[PDB]
Each structure stands twice: as structure tokens, then as C-alpha cells.
């Protein structure tokens, strides 16, 4: 009974994940084609690059509001309440399922810096519940509420793992965020179904020829023999500690912005009268600020989240690219190197700007997640630190008559994992980044940074999901 | 309060682990030097190779019996009772600590196919309790029993992780074995202290020049680009399923032997009269059967557990060593290639003999673990399967106009993980083997084999620790 239920849940989750990924990729390539095909005039290019994300955000917000307003938000605090004994039956419905799926698809295809983890884990739970009622017609044994709660808890892990194609990190993330006491039996079911879902997703990706074989999503090519030196340990630790502040600060601003949205009476009146205007206005602002030929030259705004994260994990040193740039094709990293701004300045601008863009975008009444923007911004911070350290040591570190060149990609991974843990207060972030990159050679630096960031963040601020549950 | 307690626990655990490893290595190298220095006559070499392990086993058994008979056994089921609410105060004493440490040192230096995880996690519990009692003189807040239990649970993860120098795998393994409901707060403390345990252990290893840098214990060098092909998926799955039987069978035979050891009145009377004779007799038998110039030529008896496990993880194809063996130094793998027996025959003999050897050695009244023998035998099984598959496909598998050679090392890793999971009924074993090897390229086949083996084993037989708690 249970095992076949997990198998079916994993199969349908893999299918849904694949179709959503295909849809968002199609929307992204359509946006890129529209932007590139209107390069004859800057005005028309700006008009298209503005109207497209605005249209998708307004459509998603309107569809979610009309069909099911409960689909608004991440939904992770909602399932925290569900697993804490508060049964909100309204959230687990077919209408909310369709509304949330379409809204998240449009939001991710609009190019907005948003994540999928929250809406996708919500869809995981909703699909598990719908399959529970579907199997209830063939037998009343599924009518037990305790078994339904167990399947919901397992499906949370399944969805979080299928988000990253990381069955271990996803289940650990679900255990950390959705519960405080977890049974190993529920761990077994959750990890089993997440494994099957990841397997089917990878098989579908290979079948579509998106990936040559079953491999990692964010492949890194760091040195395995000597990935890091001992003298690199303390700076890595700093990367954690500052990231913790970057976490504790972030959960602050978001909690403030919503309060500014809620406490202000004029803003509330405008929202109640013109609820579709606010997402349109903020999307206009962010699209104007990330216009590639405008300010986007200082932020590499022509890249979406996936390719930006891939570039931030590059193993080459950008600062020294100016001498051996004659025998290779033009790589994506060139987008981070405008002729007028240095690499460090571009990284600093990207950090300082994407920080508040993500902070404001997390407040939008659309189904979206926050783990992806935090991961990207932490990867940028780690890349900045790694490039600075490589500049300080141009020829690397000397150890035992050997010279090891500093790889900024390891620092970027360290920073991304540390800041994700600091924002979320979850330990699996290291496991998730390890399974995404496919290399665990940097296990100790990533782990130390994650622990330090999580500790300092917990000392300063509660988690983002706790902030949401306390504000909502 | 808590955090500094974890830091000190990790520091002392790393020191104890390092000194234990140094002592075991010294005993092993002394045994090897004694065996090699008496090559002038086979009789004297046999006499030394017999007496030395017998002497260490008898000394360990006698010291454990005289100082603290409670140190006998693995210690994992007893702490399962401890965390289940049965407080056995007699186990957590200084005398039991000393007896168990010295017995572990002697037993693992005797060359016996035994493991340390159980007795070592028992050391973890005892040292955490002793540190609590020591610092309780400085403050009363620690005579609370609930927090004592929390730190005991954390020390469980600490010890399990420090055994493998794997911060994530150790904690997850501890959660699987020692508890059914675990708090994320306890997970945080245990994982924190285990992480710093591994950090200090690796720092000490680098300082002693044992390892060049902070790296994995069982380094693999598999191809990272394309580690495996899809056509390898079903056979890998078979590797799991059979391993599950190999698990369910193993927990059977052990539970039988002790039962035969318990029900038989004559053997029991001999044990009360001659309790030191039985370990001596079994050590004599196993030393005779693993005599290198005798039967050891068919079992590679010159190699202890560590180098045997390293060799089983070799990326080279042994069947094809016979043509390119002129331009390399003599590798350890040559110990598996006698002139009279093929690789497959030697692997089958090693499997069939070491299986019952570990089954009998697990019953000895000395502090020992079973994860190491199971891991080694599963690695041998996986290596056999990989070599057979490579023989079936001499030039590898063809995919997309490319030809990829099959690496038996990945199969060995898969088999070891699957059989360890089948014996222990723990999913985490994949994480432990991943952190030991340092490569997660074969991640999906490893988890598929582990889940299949765990499922079939759980359907067939309960876990080894449950067998111990039901027999003891």
C-alpha cells in the first residue's frame, strides 16, 4: 500500500517537475529571442523587456487570486502548521493546485528572481493528498488521518528533493523546516519516494536529450587531489560569519517590508483597490533596473538564475583572463566583465542590488520561493571573496614545495551554502549544494561556513519561515 | 554552556580517535614486521602469526573481564535502551571507559576482522557523561536528566561521525540506529560536535604527516564526467537485492551462533571454566586459515582491513593487468592475483570464507563492531560483480558513438554500501561511503542498491542490533 503510493507520487512529481522546467525554459528562451530580435532600437527592446515580465506577473497574480487566493505565498509555514496539528483543509484542493502550478510557472518564466522550493513542496503535499483521496475510493484504509499526515510529511521531503534533484538534501531540508520531531519511518518513506522521483526526472531529462547522461545540474570541475589548503580555512570561516549577518539582515528587511505593506493605510487602500498594480509596478522597476544595455552592464542582467549560478561556479580566475583569452570560444563569464567596470566592482554592485531586489520580490502575492535568490546572492558573495583572495595571492598558496592556485568556485559554493543556511537555518544546504555541484572535495570549508552562519543567524534572528508565520 | 560542551567533547574525541588509530597502526606494523622478519622458516612465521593475534585477543578479553565486564559487546543496543528511557548507570563509568578503550586497541591491533563503531560510540557516550559530571561541579544546571539524555544522543552522532570522519553520515547513522524520534535541536548539537570532531582529527592527521592535507580516508579516482551508463542501472540494482539477502542471511547466522553458544550446556560449562580459551581457540583457527603462504594466497591475507578496502576501491581493471604490467611499480592489487588462481576464484573464496569468519568473530566477548567486516565483504562482492561485468564487456558500453570502459571500483562501492545498509537497516550508509570515498559520481546507483537491499532485508530479517537486544 505505502510503497506503491510513494512510487506513484514520485512518478507524477518527476513528470510535473519536468514539464514545469520545460515550460519555464521555453518562456526564458522566448524572452531572450524577443530581446535579441528587437536590437534595432533600444526603445523597442526596453519596451519588450519591460512588458513581458509585467504581463506574466500580472497574469499569474490575477489567475491565483481569482482561482484560489490560498495559493499565494511560499506555503512552507502553512505545512508547518499542518504538521503541527492545525489542519487547513482549504489549502489541499484541485483548484489551488492548478492555480499554484500556473502561477509559479508564469513567475519563473517571467525572469523574476524567485524560487520554486516553496510552491513546489506545497504542490508535493497537495498531490500526495489528492492521490490519498484517489486511493480512498479503492479502499477506506487511507482514511486514517495519522497516515495522511505521514504521507504529507514524506511528500514534503519528496518535493524538496525533486526541486534540487537531491534526495538526501531535500529530505533533510524538509525535516529541518517542516518539523521538530521526525520519525525514521517517515524518513524512510520520504527518502525512498524522493529517490524514485529524482530517478524518473533524470531519466526524462536524458530522454529529452537535455542532459547527455544522468549527471549533476550544476557541474563543477575543481581539483580533487588538492581542492583547498589549511591556510584557506579561516577566511572561509569569515565567509560563513558575514553570510550569517547577510542572513540575519535579510530576514529583517523582508519582515519590515511586509509590515510597511501592512501597517500603511494608504498602501493597504491602494492594494484593495488596485491589487494588480503593485506587482506590475515592482516588475516595471526591476525590469528597468536590470535592463542589459542600461544598468545591466554592471550586473550581467542578460543571464537568468540558472546560467548565473553556473557562471558563479566557474573554476577559472577572471582577474587573470586578460592574457589567455585568445584560444577559447567566448564563454558566459564575459558577461561579468564590462570594459568600464572591474570584476570586483561588478560583484559588489550585483550583491548590493540583487539583495534588495530579492527582498522586495519575496513579498509579491505570487507563489514563489526564496532559497534560489539567496543561493545565487551567496554564490556571488563567495565568488567575490574568492576573486579577492586570488588577487591577494596571484600564484596561489605554497605548501610542501608545491604551489596551489586559488579556485574562486570553491569560495562561491562556500558562500552560497553558508548564506542559504543563514537565511533558512537548515543544515542540509551543504548537502544540497554538494549534490547539485557533484563534488564534495570542499566539504570541510562549506560545512564550517554553514555551521558558523547558522549559529550567528539563530543568535540574531529567527528563520524566514518563522517570520512569515508570525506576520501572516 | 551547550556549545562549549560540544567543542570540548569534539576535541577530546578527536584526540582519543587519533591516539587509537596511531596505536592500532603501530600494532599492525609490528605484526607485519614480525611476520616478515621470520621468513627464514615457515614454521616460525606460522608460530608468530598465530601467537600474536591470540596474545592480543586473550589480553583484551581478560582485561575487559577483570576491569568491567559491562564493556563486553558492541554497546549500540544498550544505548538504544538508554535513549528509550532505561537508564543503565553501570555502563557509563571510568572503569568501563578504560577497559573498552584498551580492549578496542588490542582487538583492532591483533588483525581481527572487527569494527569499532559500536564500542567507539559507547566511548562517546561515556566521555560525554564524564564531562557532564566533571563540569557539574562548576554548575548545577547539568544534573537535569533530560539535557543529559540530549547530550548522550548528540555524543552518539559524535562518535559515529568521528569513526568515519564523516560529519553528515555519522549523525544520520546515529539517528537511524539509536532512536526512532529525534529532535532537530539534538541533530544540531550532535552534528556541530561531530563536525568539530572531524575537523580536529583531520588537523591532527595533517600535523602528524599521516595525510598530506585534509582529505578523504578512502580516496577514489573514478571518472567525474561520465561515471556510469544507464545500461548499468539494472545490474547495480541486482547488486542491492542480493546484498539484501547477504544482509538478511548474515544477521541470521550470527543470531544462530550465539544461540548455539547459549543453548549448548557443555559449551557454556567450558565457558564458565575456561572463558579465556574460546577467544584463544577462535583466534588460532582464524590465524591458521588466514596464513598468507598457506590459504592466504587465495584470500590475500597479507592485507589488513584498511589496505584491503583501499585495494577493492581501485579504478583499474584487474582482469586486464596481464598486458600493461611493465611500466608501473608493484601495486597492492597484485596481492589479489596469485599465479595459480584467477581473480574471480580468489574473490569468491574471499567472500565465502570472510563471511563466516566475520559472523564468528562478531560473537567474541570483546568490544567490537560489525560495520567494518560487512563493508569489506560488500566491497569484495561489488568488486566481483564489476569484474564479471567488465569481462562480459571488455571494451565497455557504447553510448552516443563513444565507448566507456566499466570501472569495477564503482561496483565495489555500490556493493559495500548496499550490504552495509542491508545488515544495519540504515539508509545513511550511502553518505558514509560517499564521504569516505570523496566522490559522489555514482550517487544514484549507490542509493538504488542501498534502498533495495534495505527493503528486502527488512522484509526478511530484523536488524543486527535488534537481534543483539533480543538475544542479550
Curated annotation (Swiss-Prot), chains A, B:
Residues of the full protein shown: 89 to 560 of 898
Alphabetical GO biological process terms: acinar cell differentiation; cell differentiation involved in salivary gland development; cellular hypotonic response; chloride transport; lung development; phagocytosis, engulfment; positive regulation of oligodendrocyte differentiation; regulation of aldosterone biosynthetic process
Organs and tissues of expression: Ubiquitously expressed. Moderately expressed in aortic and coronary vascular smooth muscle cells and expressed at a low level in aortic endothelial cells. Expressed in the adrenal gland, predominantly in the zona glomerulosa. Expressed in white mater perivascular astrocytes and ependymal cells (at protein level).
Disease involvement: Epilepsy, idiopathic generalized 11: A disorder characterized by recurring generalized seizures in the absence of detectable brain lesions and/or metabolic abnormalities. Generalized seizures arise diffusely and simultaneously from both hemispheres of the brain.
Protein family: Belongs to the chloride channel (TC 2.A.49) family. ClC-2/CLCN2 subfamily.
Domain of life according to the entry: Eukaryota
Main localization (coarse): membrane
Modification after translation: Phosphorylated. Activated by dephosphorylation.
Protein name (database record): Chloride channel protein 2
Motif (Selectivity filter part_3): 369-373
Keywords per UniProt: Acetylation, CBS domain, Cell membrane, Cell projection, Chloride, Chloride channel, Disease variant, Epilepsy, Ion channel, Ion transport, Membrane, Phosphoprotein, Postsynaptic cell membrane, Repeat, Synapse, Transmembrane, Transmembrane helix, Transport, Voltage-gated channel
Transmembrane domains' residue ranges: 1-33, 42-67, 92-110, 117-135, 187-207, 233-261, 270-289, 341-361, 369-392, 443-460
Subunit note: Homodimer. Interacts with auxiliary subunit HEPACAM.
Motif Selectivity filter part_2 location, chain numbering: 115-119
Regulation affecting activity: Common gate kinetics are down-regulated by intracellular ATP. Inhibited by AK-42, a derivative of meclofenamate. Inhibited by Cd(2+). Inhibited by Zn(2+) and PKC activation. Inhibited at acidic pH. CCLN2:HEPACAM channel conductance is up-regulated upon hypo-osmolarity.
Organism: Homo sapiens (Human)
Residue numbers binding chloride: 74, 371, 465
